Chain A
Amino acid sequence: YVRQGALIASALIMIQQTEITCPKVNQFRQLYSKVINDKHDDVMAKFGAILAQGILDAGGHNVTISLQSRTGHTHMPSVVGVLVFTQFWFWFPLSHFLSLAYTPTCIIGLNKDLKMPKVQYKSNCKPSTFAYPAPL
């Protein structure tokens, strides 16, 4: 019961936080896949371990769940999804709702015909310290 809740919660933080920003990401990633392959654990525990995997890794290492909205009140589709998610014990299909929380993280500047380009913005970080999460 503690294991299932702790492990899901970890997954929510780790999205777009990488192996070269905490060792924790290495430990967590490895642990997910180990559970599915093995039968060592009790089945109750595995349900939590496997959902937590999809969240951490999500979207090909491209998507994040936001803190808030663009200003003010907490992002509107995101909060709901999570509320219903936490209850999954009585009914398994409730876990699906976590797709709604995922929003792609791109800051977008545009051309004067108003369609996606590859324009640049400056961000002060080091490429030795942030990079997209390494797969399982």
Chain B
Amino acid sequence: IKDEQKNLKKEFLHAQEEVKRIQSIPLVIGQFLEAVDQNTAIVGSTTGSNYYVRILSTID
């Protein structure tokens, strides 16, 4: 379990890198309309489409 935990640390970074691509551009701009929850939220975009969106952990 000790060596395992160290192993798992390396996985977190690998994973962080992979996700990062998805995370960047194409990125549309909304306004933060309201919060349904603190895991999914509602944001309203600038072509008028309102969206049901997931919150990606890389912010608070």
Q: Do chains A and B touch in the complex (CB under 8 A)?
A: no
Please list the residues of chain B having a beta carbon within 8 angstroms of any beta carbon in chain A.
none
